[PDB]
Structure formats: structure tokens, C-alpha cells
């Protein structure tokens, strides 16, 4: 059934002064809405190509499904990842961060750095690799969804996520976003990934 724009868990100004009201409103009401609308259109066209046996057409649609489907996935997670009252990591998550990265401080630095270094548009991720039972960090280009691991915490470093407030200074945004990291949600995602 059809994809829909999820309501945010908070009002558009609830993350000030870390993320502005204007940024939240445009990012949700315009950017994410566009990914959803275009996603529904692409899924229709793909369902038609598959039904008709138009293999070339079905292949040709893949980048648009990845882009808009990834936009939907990534943003949906991102809204659940942000809070004014984020709390602290669960003990078990905190313990695993210490095991895999040494400390939360190291994790935040190492993820901030790779996220900061993204060339162009993309995302930084903290994820959980089920196979090897370890936390990992990665970046993704554009809206490519995080693959090979379960997403826990995402940082959108598309210039739309920060330019209106932080201008060119991407590092100020990436460092500041940790202050609104929704650790309750991130810990819930970690618990589910270990099931």
C-alpha cells in the first residue's frame, strides 16, 4: 500500500537552537514529502514494467526507486533519531560503544569526521552488524540506504539539512547534532537489531 509522509514526533521549532524551525519545516513538509510522492509514482511505474515483462524499463527505474525510496527510509529514521529530550544511551548500548569504539567521545569524533568528509550530498550512520555482532560507522552517498548493517543513528549532511542556519560551516552542524540525538530511540533500535 501507498507510502505516506510520517508526522514528526515533535513540532517544527522543537529542536532550536540546534536546528531551526525553517530548516525543519522545509526538510519535512517539502523535501521528505517530495521523496514520498515521487516514490509512489516510481513504484507504480515499476509494478507496471514488471507486470508487462518490460525488463529494460524495470531496470531503468531502479535509480529513481533507490533515490526516492532511500529518501523515504532515511528521513523516516532521521526524525525518530532527533529529540529535545534525547536522554542517555541505555546501559547495554553505552557498554557496546565503549567495547567497539573505546568511548562515546571517540565514536562521536570518528562519525562526525567521516560525515564531515562526505563529498557532495549524503549521510553518516552508526549501525549494528548482526553477523559479526559489532557496531560500525559508515557514510552513504545521496539517498542510498545504509546496507549491510541495521541503522541506529543517522546524520543528514545534504546541504539542505544545515545551510540556512550554519551556512557553509558543516562541521558546526555535525558537532551540534549530537546534542539532540534521541538516545532512547537509538537504544530501542539497538535492542531490536540484537534480537
Amino acid at each position: 500500500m501507498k507510502h505516506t509522509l510520517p508526522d514528526l514526533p515533535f513540532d517544527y521549532a522543537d529542536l532550536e537552537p540546534v536546528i531551526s524551525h525553517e530548516i525543519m519545516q522545509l526538510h519535512h513538509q517539502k523535501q521528505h514529502a517530495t521523496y514520498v510522492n515521487n516514490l509512489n509514482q516510481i513504484e507504480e511505474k515499476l509494478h507496471e514494467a514488471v507486470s508487462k515483462g518490460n525488463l529494460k524499463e524495470a531496470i531503468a527505474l531502479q535509480p529513481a526507486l533507490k533515490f526516492n525510496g532511500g529518501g523515504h527510509i532515511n528521513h523516516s529514521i532521521f526524525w525518530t533519531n532527533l529529540a529535545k529530550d534525547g536522554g542517555e544511551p541505555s546501559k547495554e548500548l553505552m557498554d557496546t560503544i565503549k567495547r567497539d569504539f573505546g568511548s562515546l567521545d571517540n565514536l562521536q569524533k570518528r562519525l562526525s569526521d567521516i560525515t564531515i568528509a562526505v563529498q557532495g550530498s549524503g549521510w553518516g550512520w552508526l549501525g549494528y552488524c548482526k553477523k559479526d555482532k559489532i557496531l560500525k560507522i559508515a557514510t552513504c552517498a545521496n539517498q542510498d540506504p545504509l546496507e549491510g548493517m541495521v541503522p541506529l543513528f543517522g546524520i543528514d549532511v545534504w546541504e539542505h539539512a544545515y545551510y540556512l542556519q550554519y551556512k557553509n560551516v558543516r562541521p558546526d552542524y555535525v558537532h551540534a547534532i549530537w546534542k539532540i540525538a534521541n538516545w532512547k530511540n537509538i537504544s530501542e533500535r539497538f535492542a531490536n537489531a540484537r534480537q
Copy 2:
């Protein structure tokens, strides 16, 4: 489900340009595998889509492009080759002369880019309906040709020549022009113009 098409000729009909063992393996093993895998991946993809698993549906894309591309590319390629391929129709020859100067220039230019492919892939002559022109391009791996109509393809995966030509890809790419099925290429051209 998708099926392996029969070749329009016997496995040895392209000797001495492409060998029997190459045609047999290429068709019965390589193309077969793309077809069989295409069917498995299409099945996995339908489950993912019918269940709402967008992430898994996106994760299956590369296998669909690869095996689906494999099926598309090879199916065109077999129709592109002939023991006696004739000559290009007058309309195609005139178009080749318009857009490349001569057949010689087209062959050289398409051979050169196809030889230069880094890794596995394909060289193509195609027709851009929009700007009403012939174009040459390459594709990586089994990516299908997009943005123009395919007319003539040259498989430069190593499995396409190695048993016979060993490392000498250029010899294979220059030699395949001897068996280019110009009857088929011309028909694809005529159909691309309608």
C-alpha cells in the same frame, strides 16, 4: 518465467571468428545462468515488494540489473552475429556516413572504445531517436544500453574471447566485424526509426 532463447545458428557456424567451445559455454552456461538467476531474483524481489520491504527491494536491484542486463544483452548479441551478415542497408549506410563519415570511421571508433573498456562490459552502436543520430557507447558489466536504441553490440567480457584469442582482445574486437549481422542491424535500425 524468462527462457534461454535458441541461437539462430549452430555452435560452430561463426568459426573461424568465434569458436564452438566459446559459443557453447557462452550460450549454455553463461546466458543460462543469467536467465536462471534472473528468475530467482525476480521471485525474491516480488516477495519484497508485495510485503512492503522497500529496503530489501532496493538491495535486490543490482542483481536484477546484472542478470536482467545479462539476458537482454546476450539475447541481442546472438541476433547480431551471422556466418554471412551481408552489408548495411542503404539507409543505414547513408546514416553511418552522415554521422561518422564512413563505415571505416565507425568501426575504428567503436572498436577503440570497446577495446578500452576497463574490466568487463560491452560496446554498442545505437540510435538516439530524440536527436536523430547514431551514437557509440560502452556499458560496464551487464548494464543494458540506455538512452539510445541498441543496434549492434560487442561483448568484451573475457569469457567472450579468452579460450580463442587469449589476452588479445583487440584481435577479437576487430575480427567480430567480419560476422556482424548487417541484416539484423539494419532491421533494428528500421524499427528504431518507426
Copy 3:
């Protein structure tokens, strides 16, 4: 010798109301400056890797050279491509646009559309293909320089090029930029490409 940030051919507010003063100032003084500074650093590291015979290291530096070197190339061209008094295409350029695209209106639409459709960060280009003696349009991802043809006119569709003024509405920017297309410069580039 060392790369430097070129002075703009105009003052930071000279393209209002099509491109804001704030956008011009950040884009030149901060974004392009960063590409230049990082480019010089990367060229040094590459010259060292080559001198030492450190082939793996020289290969590893390539994405950063492409990114920052491309940033320098692309922006350098882009500033010369913009003017308040852009004039009109030379007769010969106009005649070739008509030959290859039917009309200027068609060219502007077709280039605007592909530029608008860029997934992520990138550029739209009008270029000249010397081999086939034809105008072409293309997009490039991120800062990848236009290859296979001589660049004539570039449209930066990184969100930094427009978000402060146009917000999410990229099409309004892409359509509007044609009003400040420096046709004198573009025509000069066309003449040189045909030599």
C-alpha cells in the same frame, strides 16, 4: 605553481535579484576558497607520493584531487559564465544552438530539465564536442569536471548555489539563471572550442 582563488568579474551583489549577495559571498569566499586550499594540499601530497614511488598512496589521493580540482575548475568557469549585462549569443553560437537543439528555448528547457533532475549535488553543462562538431548537454556529479567536450556554460545545482534564496525550489533557480547567462563569455568559449 600554486592555485589561487580568482577574483570575481563583479561585486558580490551584482547578480541580484537572481542570485543573492549572501550566496555569492559564501560561494566564492568560502566554498571556492576551500576547494583551492584543499587542492594545493592534495597536489603536494600527490607530488610526494609520485616522487617516492608510493603508487598505492598516489591512487588513494585521486578522489580528493578530482573533487577539489574539479571544484576549482567548475567554479572558475562558473564565475566567468555569469553577468548582469550578459548580452546575446554571437550569431555563430546562436546559429549552432538552432542547428543542434532547434532553438534557444529548446536548449534552455532541455538543459534546465536535466539539471533540475540531478540526484544529489552536481552541475549541468552546455559543451562543445570537437570530434563530432556538435553542441551537447550533460550533467556531472559532485565536482566531477565535464569531460569529453569543451565546457561552454555551467549551472551549479549544489544546494549551496541556491538554498538561501530559493529554499527547496530548485527549478525557480535553474530557470532564473538564464537571465544572468554571460553570453559574451559563452560565445568566446564557443569560438575557442572551434579553433
Copy 4:
């Protein structure tokens, strides 16, 4: 300029796992070509850089990565194979057991991803000095392994197996473990830990 290294063994020493014709062509023709081209491209690149032609220097990057990668990858690969490769040192075996459970799990997991390479490429076992762990990865075409130290590589370009194994890549990838030079792999491991 770069040179083709001699093999540490005679062309037939890996029979029956890899044939004489494969080793000869692979070394004398494939690797030679990467070396020779590497030299040509390095020359073109130096002219571009010394003249300030940034655009042309960027345009030559893919040929440097490809031929330079080719030289890097093959040079490691020849040292990675042996008629009698021994067994992993105790320190490497313990590390393999820590990070993969057993040698069996490592072999299966690396074989599976290497077999799955779409097109040409390589499978690698490497060591991540930062997080102090073994990792497995694949690389496309001749891209060199980056972000970890290379320990053991498996060439899955078709030229590496086709003359002998034909289409049956899995057989070649499972069989190469028989000739993995664990003396060399262990030395690379010891050097990766210093």
C-alpha cells in the same frame, strides 16, 4: 620505471590448481601490459602536472588506478600462492578464530563474496590496524584494496581461471585455498601488526 617482477616459482608449479598456460599468459601478458601501460600513463600524467593541466591530470586518473592497481594487485597475488603454502602461523590462526570463528568460516565467507563479484575484480582478506581486526572485502576491476592492509587476494577476473575452469568460477575460488601461501600471508600479517 616500474618492472614486471619474476614469479617466485615456475609457470607449472601450481598445477593442478592453476595451469601453466594460465600462469604464463597471466604473468607475461596481463601483468606485463599493466606495467607497460602504467609507465605510459605515468609519463602523460607528469607532463599534465608539470604544465599545469589540471583537467587532463584528472582525466588520466582512471588509467593510473587501473594499470597501477593491476601492478599492485598482481605483485601481491604471485607472493600469495605456493605449491606448498604451509599453514597459518599461530598468531594468525588465533586472530582468524577470534574474528571469524574458524578458518572454515573465513574461507567460506571470503569465497562467497569473491564468487559473487559482478564482472571483474578481486576478493581480499585484510587487516584493519585502527580497529585491530581482520576484514574481508571485494574490489572492482583493478581497484587496489584500501582502508586495510592486504594479506591474501583472489583474482576473479575471468582470465585468471577460464582456460581451465571455463565458466565455473566457484570451483576455482574454492580450490585456490589449496595453494594459499600461508607463509607469505602470515608474514604480511606480522608486518601489518608492527
